[PDB]
Every structure is written in C-alpha cells, then in structure tokens.
C-alpha cells in the first residue's frame, strides 16, 4: 500500500483520479484497416506524430455494456503494436483508442496542459541532504 515514490516522473496513470484528466475529448473511434498476429494497422492514426498513442489502451464492446481493454506497447506511423497479441480483436468491429501519457512534465503540460496536477518532482532535489559532509 506504499503507492508513493519521490521520482522525477509523474507516478500517475493517465486518467486516474489523481491526474484528473478527461480522456473523452481524446477518444478516437475507427475501424481497423488490417489486423495481423501482433500488429493492428489503421490509416487514421497515421496522421498523428510517432508515439502519440504510446501508453494508451484500446477498448471495444464485447457484449452488452461490457468492453474488453488492451494496452499498447508502441505506436509508430500507421501500425499499432498490441501487448500480448491481437487475438480476440474483431477484424471489422468498432474500436475506441485513447492516447497515453509518458509522465514527463514537459509531456504532461505541452500535450494535456495538466501541469498544476503534475504529481512528479522534476527538480526539487535528487540527493541533497541537510546532514551531509561538504555542501560544496
């Protein structure tokens, strides 16, 4: 139950109750062009910069009001890499894809402008104690 570390990165999953970032505007609905064993390719995402979707997840409706979610290893051009393979993904079903946050403060503010809620500690201190040996 620690769930706390004094590191540079955000230490928060994009969209959690701590980031307070609304992903609904960033939702993208698309029909995949081609599905392979490990790669799902679509031309619509080809218009975004490389790594835009890295760290995001893909959710689609299985039955009723329940959706199955899959994380994305990497995004490059028109090809998306799916962790654990693409098995179970419908070839023509409607898919919802959300972006992913790298966690860097520059990434957090330039893309999402959520710097005030940034949970990371970029440049407060790395080691400096007040009971060391020589300050200089």
């Amino acid at each position: 139950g620690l769930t706390d570390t004094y590191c540079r990165t955000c230490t928060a999953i994009v969209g959690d109750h701590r980031c307070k970032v609304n992903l609904v505007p960033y939702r993208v609905t698309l029909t995949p062009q081609s599905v392979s064993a490990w790669v799902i390719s679509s031309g619509v995402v080809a218009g975004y910069a490389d790594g835009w979707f890295t760290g995001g997840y893909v959710e689609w409706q299985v039955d009723g009001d329940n959706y199955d979610r899959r994380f994305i290893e990497q995004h490059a051009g028109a090809d998306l890499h799916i962790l654990g393979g693409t098995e179970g993904i419908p070839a023509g079903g409607q898919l919802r894809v959300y972006p992913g946050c790298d966690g860097l403060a520059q990434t957090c503010d330039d893309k999402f402008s959520n710097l005030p809620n940034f949970r990371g500690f970029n440049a407060m201190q790395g080691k400096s104690p007040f009971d060391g040996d020589q300050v200089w």
Binding site: D4, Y6, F121, M124, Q125, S128, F130, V135
Partner: protein
C-alpha cells in the same frame, strides 16, 4: 602592527531547501533540532 580594523572569526551560512513530509498533513506543531525547541506553535493553512 596593531589590531586589525576587523577580524573574520566565522562565517554565517544560508541555504534554501525544499522538502516534503509525506502525504497530506493537517497541522505542524513544533520543530526540534539538537534537543532544543527552535519553534513551537500551530498552523492549519498555507502560509509563512
């Protein structure tokens, strides 16, 4: 010759440190250093 106009017997060191006490806290009561009570009181809102 004679006693200097002034003598540098020691230096005063100033440092500006930023630190965190953990997760959200309600009230800070006192600060103790080297067994001497430096400050005692109570603050419940962001301030100086």
């Amino acid at each position: 010759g004679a006693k200097p106009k002034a003598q540098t017997v020691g230096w005063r060191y100033y440092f500006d440190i930023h630190f965190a006490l953990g997760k959200k806290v309600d009230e800070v009561c006192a600060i103790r250093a080297s067994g001497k009570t430096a400050w005692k009181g109570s603050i419940t809102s962001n301030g100086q």
